[PDB]
């Protein structure tokens, strides 16, 4: 009730009652907000509303001060002052961008652009507002009731009439009813219960909507440059394996925070784990937004770090299966691996935040609020996939607008850049280096002569809105009969419906481009499926082709990306 202005920090009893987050506003900023937007409800201890009985005047521009009470133009006493006048709204202790964040629906790319170009406090107001909007939007959907249960990984659902049906993919995690979280995939659909329970007919599901907590800490702490490695104690017995990263681990101790751009297979996990061998006495908290990203840090630490000082923090509401080799929930072990949502209230000598393109500004702020560290390291790549923006339907979100860290990496450049790709055949490295890394990524492997491209538009069908291209899967089927070594390939496509069809027709294991991020496979078979802005996204294309160690087959729809692929072309 007695707070600080989310724009100029001036203390005030004023708050905007029309803002979903009800931000505290000072007299100067409250005025400029109410006179420029549809937001006219001002709240303090008592709201600014006509105190005359039965009067429904809540607009602060149509209200006055009747001694110590508030009344409209039709009820005010002779001696009464307008609440709104002289560039201020009457309050104790007597912006174009704030207005846009406050009133937008978050469906345009320009909303997210502003949420990252604004001041630091407006980045937090934007991140809070956006998340509150995303959760409340979930409430507006239709309930799925289990009509029948065929088998253990198959069922038929009945949907609510008059309310939209959400897209069935592991993107949307439904809460079953209180029989745990479940997911769906294609009238034969597949049910995926995080908690195993004999699929009860009649029992319904409802979308997971969690409470948006206020943000206190900034997305990025104020940068500090030090003259010497501060609060960290390095070794002289640094193993040759991590010798290449020594000069950068030193940079990490001479800065409050540091950014690392690591293209696919340049050694991000290796760099993060090697930083623990360089500052061996330092307590390191390893974080990321996904469980799979934290598990990739756990797999790398298992090899170089002592398994006794390692703890994988698992939230009590254990959703899907994760890393099982460290002592679970020991917050005090020297190395703590944990997702951002599960981060306990603790301190560290170094905090390593991996897969930074997947972080939102809400996540950047949570980390600064739960972990007080001497040094913060942000590892990732703005040329890879960002976190899905469910409300965004108009415009394309650029990497410099994913979050504060990506904005920095794309504007002033990253502090550190891992320039040599050790995973991919040179054909893949040469293609993505020119596409998203302005020729700064270098190939370590030779050309494998196992990277192929085929131009085939096929036939695009649609399962609600996820696309299928059966003739492209047919081309893969014909390729596999001629190249049976490719039987050990992972099938990748931008759509789960294409993946669902290819799983039944080819029998290859399946992965969408988005779920393949961070993983590597000897052979990849990619069917673009469509030429949409989704399937043509350069970050998604980059992730797709950089999953392969040995060979890749790309069946393309877009002439542009097909011509850009530095692969052997195949006929048929």
Please report, in range form, the residues annotated as the binding site for a ribonucleoside 5'-triphosphate. Answer: 262-269
Please give the Cα distance from 286 to 293 (Å, whole number). 10
Please give the Cα distance from 495 to 472 (Å, whole number). 13
Q: Which residues of 217-235 are buried (b: 16+ CB within 10 A; e: fewer)?
A: bbbbeeeeeeeebeebeee
Residue 27 binds to Zn ion (criterion: CB under 5 A): no
Binding site feature residues:
5, 8, 16, 19, 26, 29, 33, 39, 50, 55, 72, 75, 262-269
Please give the Cα distance from 72 to 39 (Å, whole number). 17
Please give the Cα distance from 558 to 384 (Å, whole number). 19
Residue 131 binds to Zn ion (criterion: CB under 5 A): no
Using the Cα atoms of residue 454, residue 530, residue 189 and residue 517 in order, give the sign of their dihedral: positive
- Judged by beta carbon, residue 18 or residue 424, the one nearer Zn ion is 18
- Judged by beta carbon, residue 55 or residue 485, the one nearer Zn ion is 55
- Find the binder of Zn ion among 43, 60, 72, 561 (CB under 5 A): 72
- Judged by beta carbon, residue 16 or residue 371, the one nearer Zn ion is 16
Residue 451 binds to Zn ion (criterion: CB under 5 A): no
Cβ atoms of residues 43 and 83 within 8 Å: no
Cβ atoms of residues 512 and 486 within 8 Å: no
- Judged by beta carbon, residue 26 or residue 285, the one nearer Zn ion is 26
Please give the Cα distance from 270 to 277 (Å, whole number). 11
Residue number, nearest CB to Zn ion:
8
Total residues binding Zn ion (CB under 5 A): 17
Please give the Cα distance from 263 to 417 (Å, whole number). 8
Residue 383 binds to Zn ion (criterion: CB under 5 A): no
- Judged by beta carbon, residue 5 or residue 554, the one nearer Zn ion is 5
Minimum distance of Zn ion from residue 119's CB (angstroms): 11
Minimum distance of Zn ion from residue 215's CB (angstroms): 17
Residue 314 binds to Zn ion (criterion: CB under 5 A): no
Minimum distance of Zn ion from residue 24's CB (angstroms): 9
- Judged by beta carbon, residue 26 or residue 289, the one nearer Zn ion is 26
Residue 55 binds to Zn ion (criterion: CB under 5 A): yes
- Find the binder of Zn ion among 19, 348, 454, 480 (CB under 5 A): 19
Which one of the spans 36-44, 78-86, 190-198, 563-571 is the region binding Zn ion (CB under 5 A)?
36-44
How many residues belong to the chain? 572
Residue 29 binds to Zn ion (criterion: CB under 5 A): yes
Minimum distance of Zn ion from residue 59's CB (angstroms): 11
Residue 552 binds to Zn ion (criterion: CB under 5 A): no
Please give the Cα distance from 301 to 338 (Å, whole number). 13
Please give the Cα distance from 382 to 288 (Å, whole number). 15
Minimum distance of Zn ion from residue 72's CB (angstroms): 3
Residue 423 binds to Zn ion (criterion: CB under 5 A): no
Q: How far is CA 170 from the centre of its chain?
A: 15
Which residues does the chain break after (C to N > 2.5 Å)? 94, 177, 186
Minimum distance of Zn ion from residue 116's CB (angstroms): 20
Could you report how far apart the first and last alpha carbons of the chain are, in Å?
Answer: 71
Residue 4 binds to Zn ion (criterion: CB under 5 A): no
Residue 18 binds to Zn ion (criterion: CB under 5 A): yes
Q: Please name the helix (run of DSSP H) or strand (run of DSSP E) that holds residue 550, with its range, or none.
A: strand 548-556
Looking at residue 117, what DSSP letter applies? H
- Judged by beta carbon, residue 57 or residue 556, the one nearer Zn ion is 57
Cβ atoms of residues 283 and 349 within 8 Å: yes
Please give the Cα distance from 114 to 355 (Å, whole number). 23
Which one of the spans 3-11, 182-190, 529-537, 551-559 is the region binding Zn ion (CB under 5 A)?
3-11
Please give the Cα distance from 185 to 167 (Å, whole number). 9
- Judged by beta carbon, residue 75 or residue 123, the one nearer Zn ion is 75
- Judged by beta carbon, residue 118 or residue 143, the one nearer Zn ion is 118
Using the Cα atoms of residue 240, residue 241, residue 244 and residue 249 in order, give the sign of their dihedral: negative
Rounded to 10 degrees, the C-alpha dihedral 345/355/412/377 comes to 40
- Find the binder of Zn ion among 102, 289, 356, 556 (CB under 5 A): 102
Residue 397 binds to Zn ion (criterion: CB under 5 A): no
Backbone angles phi, psi at 176, to 5 degrees: -85, 140
Residue 547 binds to Zn ion (criterion: CB under 5 A): no
Residue 5 binds to Zn ion (criterion: CB under 5 A): yes
- Find the binder of Zn ion among 8, 143, 254, 277 (CB under 5 A): 8
Collapsing DSSP to helix, strand or coil, 192 comes out as strand
- Judged by beta carbon, residue 58 or residue 503, the one nearer Zn ion is 58
Which one of the spans 55-63, 203-211, 218-226, 451-459 is the region binding Zn ion (CB under 5 A)?
55-63
Residue 49 binds to Zn ion (criterion: CB under 5 A): no
Binding site feature residues for Zn(2+):
5, 8, 16, 19, 26, 29, 33, 39, 50, 55, 72, 75
Please give the Cα distance from 538 to 496 (Å, whole number). 19
Cβ atoms of residues 93 and 26 within 8 Å: yes
Query: Given the rule CB under 5 A, which residues bind Zn ion?
Result: 5, 7-8, 10, 16, 18-19, 26, 29, 39, 50, 52, 55, 57, 72, 75, 102
């Amino acid at each position: 009730a007695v707070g600080a202005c989310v724009l100029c920090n001036s203390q005030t009893s004023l708050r905007c009652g029309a803002c979903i987050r009800r931000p505290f506003l000072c007299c100067k900023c409250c005025y400029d907000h109410v006179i420029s937007t549809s937001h006219k409800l001002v709240l303090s201890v008592n709201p600014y509303v006509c105190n005359a009985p039965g009067c429904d005047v809540t607009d602060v521009t149509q209200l006055y001060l009747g001694g110590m009470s508030y009344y409209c133009k039709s009820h005010k006493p002779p001696i009464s002052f307008p609440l709104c006048a002289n560039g201020q709204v009457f309050g104790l202790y007597k912006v174009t961008d704030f207005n846009a964040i406050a009133t937008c629906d978050w469906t345009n790319a320009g909303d997210y652009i502003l949420a990252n170009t604004c001041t630091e406090r407006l980045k937090l107001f934007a991140a809070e507002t956006l998340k509150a909007t995303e959760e409340t939007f979930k409430l507006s959907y239709g309930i799925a009731t289990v009509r029948e249960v065929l088998s253990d990984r198959e069922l038929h659902l009945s949907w609510e009439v008059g309310k939209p049906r959400p897209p069935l993919n592991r993107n949307y995690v439904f809460t079953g009813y209180q029989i745990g979280e479940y997911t769906f995939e294609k009238d034969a659909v597949v049910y995926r219960g995080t908690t195993t329970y004999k699929l009860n007919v009649g029992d319904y599901f409802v979308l997971t909507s969690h409470t948006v907590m206020p943000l206190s800490a900034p997305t990025l702490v104020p940068q500090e440059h030090y003259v010497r490695i501060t609060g960290l104690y390095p070794t002289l017995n640094i193993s040759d394996e991590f010798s290449s990263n020594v000069a950068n681990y030193q940079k990490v101790g001479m800065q409050k925070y540091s950014t690392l751009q690591g293209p696919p297979g340049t050694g991000k996990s290796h760099f993060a784990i090697g930083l623990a061998l360089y500052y061996p006495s330092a307590r390191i908290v390893y974080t990321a937004c996904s469980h799979a990203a934290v598990d990739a840090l756990c797999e790398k630490a298992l090899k170089y770090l002592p398994i006794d000082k390692c703890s994988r923090i698992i939230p009590a509401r254990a959703r899907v299966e994760c890393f099982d080799k460290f002592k679970v929930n020991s917050t005090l072990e020297q190395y703590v691996f944990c997702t951002v949502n599960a981060l306990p209230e603790t301190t560290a000598d170094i905090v390593v935040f991996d897969e930074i393109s997947m972080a939102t500004n809400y996540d950047l702020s949570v980390v600064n609020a739960r972990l007080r560290a001497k040094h913060y390291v942000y590892i990732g790549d703005p040329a890879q996939l960002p976190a899905p923006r469910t409300l965004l339907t108009k415009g394309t979100l650029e990497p410099e607008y994913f979050n504060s860290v990506c904005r920095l990496m794309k504007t002033i450049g990253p502090d550190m850049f891992l320039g040599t790709c050790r995973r991919c055949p040179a054909e893949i490295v040469d293609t993505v280096s020119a596409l998203v890394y302005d020729n700064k990524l270098k190939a370590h492997k030779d050309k494998s002569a196992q990277c192929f491209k085929m131009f085939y538009k096929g036939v695009i069908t649609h399962d609600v809105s996820s696309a299928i291209n059966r003739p492209q899967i047919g081309v893969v089927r014909e390729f596999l009969t001629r190249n049976p070594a490719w039987r050990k390939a992972v099938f990748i496509s931008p759509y789960n419906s294409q993946n669902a069809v290819a799983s039944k027709i080819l029998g290859l294991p399946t992965q969408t481009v988005d779920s393949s991020q961070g993983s590597e496979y000897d052979y990849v078979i990619f069917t673009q499926t469509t030429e949409t802005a989704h399937s043509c996204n350069v970050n998604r294309f980059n992730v797709a082709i950089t999953r392969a160690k040995v060979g890749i087959l790309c069946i393309m729809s877009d002439r542009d990306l097909y011509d850009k692929l530095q692969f052997t072309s195949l006929e048929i």
